[PDB]
Design a protein around this ligand. Sequence first.
Ligand SMILES: CCCCN1C(=O)/C(=C/c2ccc(O)cc2)SC1=S
Ligand SMILES: CCCCN1C(=O)/C(=C\c2ccc(O)cc2)SC1=S
Ligand SMILES: [Mn+2]
Ligand SMILES: [Mn+2]
Ligand SMILES: [Mn+2]
Ligand SMILES: [Mn+2]
Lengths: 331, 321
Amino acid sequence: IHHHHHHVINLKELKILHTSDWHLGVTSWTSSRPVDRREELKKALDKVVEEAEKREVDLILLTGDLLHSRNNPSVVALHDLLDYLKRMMRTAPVVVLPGNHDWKGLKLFGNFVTSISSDITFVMSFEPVDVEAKRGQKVRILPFPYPDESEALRKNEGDFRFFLESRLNKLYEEALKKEDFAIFMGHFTVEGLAGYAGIEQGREIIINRALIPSVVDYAALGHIHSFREIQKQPLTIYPGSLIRIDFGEEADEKGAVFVELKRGEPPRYERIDASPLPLKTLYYKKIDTSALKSIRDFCRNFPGYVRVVYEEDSGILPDLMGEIDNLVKIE
Amino acid sequence: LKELKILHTSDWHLGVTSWTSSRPVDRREELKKALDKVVEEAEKREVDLILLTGDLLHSRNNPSVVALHDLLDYLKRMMRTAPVVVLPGNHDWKGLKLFGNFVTSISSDITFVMSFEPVDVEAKRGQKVRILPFPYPDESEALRKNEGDFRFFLESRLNKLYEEALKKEDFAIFMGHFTVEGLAGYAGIEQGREIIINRALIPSVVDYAALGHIHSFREIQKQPLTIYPGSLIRIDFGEEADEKGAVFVELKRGEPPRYERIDASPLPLKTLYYKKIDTSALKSIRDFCRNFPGYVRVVYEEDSGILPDLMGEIDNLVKIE
Ligand SMILES: CCCCN1C(=O)/C(=C/c2ccc(O)cc2)SC1=S
Ligand SMILES: CCCCN1C(=O)/C(=C\c2ccc(O)cc2)SC1=S
Ligand SMILES: [Mn+2]
Ligand SMILES: [Mn+2]
Ligand SMILES: [Mn+2]
Ligand SMILES: [Mn+2]
């Protein structure tokens, strides 16, 4: 058969796969017990790809930090990124909003790749782009990247806030000039995020969720590790990461999002669970004989990674990280 | 299909600034003009395949944003004319191999041959073209071996390419990035380690051998037809007498190949020779550079005391030796 897009007359539906924050190349807990997350991460990524093919999505949205290293990604990480980029392109057209990166050639290569393929689009600026989905649907993309060049704002918090609002207003005006569907893609922190620990060694951009253009069919956000349904109109979702990067994500549910849009109907979405390895933190005052029993008993049949937090040294501690290959951190 | 029209250009050196030690000159504007002329000629002749070899970027490992932009720009302009096959030169960046394979996988109008493995490509009119790539042996940029085991390694791959070239469909094209042994009128290595290959070891069973890495055009041999196209601009005064451009190659199954040189007409260079720099010499130098639309070098033999600031009063004079 053929392997290009279909063209269905008068089709007013759009199936979306939105995944985010892969962090390809991460090794966790380097200061205590380094753990290469690649195998677990590739397992989760395969699960998301398989779900995209089964549901026959029309469009794949990629946000957040797909690479863990901001400026020196390894060859293996780059290989995995390009590998999984191709695996999605074979399924449906891909739109990528690259996260916070420094390299200045990356925009040129992103524009080059976009120019030579009709199945992947890199949105590297604030300018809107019209793309074509798997079944011919015309989709207008409203991108809100991290304001590059001025990673140092070079201005007070008052002109900057008005600059961001002006960009959001322009995106609103461009979203009104839409054909079929319109999707917002943003790389920032929604104002007053509930249960959001804080910036993980980085400068954060804060945007009020009401400033997201209401006339878009979906708002695809990234940069935060935890899934969050920010609002319903417009439906605004952070998908979260695919693995639990650190123990702050112990209680998180990890995966991607399947969004279905229908003209005339309200949008609906399902969470695609990647079911990565679990995390557990064990708390003790001192590591006494009672604590040693609780640690060894829990870790023995726990299929994930364990952290132990204690207050005071009570003598010499046994080689717990030797008898327990599951124990990755004792502070 | 039993015909194949080829545009072969090489060694663009995008991003070069000439004569940095004396009077830097950004060659970008001149180079883009020459590149535009080659692109236009590819469209006019309606080539079926475009071959890119040599140093498309002047900087081996730190190309500027402007240079990278121009490279990707003219890559796209070539892809719009006919399918492109690129033999990238010696580079350090390790992502280059992954990105090259990625771009090749996602577009059916460009192919980056990043290894010794043969690749089959399809030309504009459906011609099946087998590419026999001979890149600079990466990893071992330091040979890590004597000249005897290394030479046998290279010969083994040329033999392998010969055997793979025999298993061809329509046409077979060799692409190599090396220096042919005993090049006639070849100054020498321009600040680099050279790999030397005897031209008789180029597999004779290919329809065309597209070479690069040399600034000056060379017809190495006719069976198999082996050509360096040369650079598109005169990078330095050693190329003063060179004619610069690309090569248009026409192949016909069963017939001998023929080629035409496509003149890019870049700026001319001129070297002025004097015994000593006397007052008559300054007048002649200033008068010549005033009406010369290119770049001028002055070399003189005898110390002539202090000479006026010729490189200040003459924006045309780029080098005094
Ligand atoms: C798929 C692109 C194919 C063409 N192409 C490049 O993108 C290159 C890039 C490069 C980048 C950094 C550096 O330090 C040296 C080279 S070289 C080359 S050919
Ligand atoms: C999150 C989307 C990322 C998309 N993306 C890259 O980041 C690429 C290459 C790269 C190379 C060197 C470096 O330091 C950083 C990046 S190529 C490509 S597509
Ligand atoms: Mn981020
Ligand atoms: Mn993140
Ligand atoms: Mn070279
Ligand atoms: Mn060269």
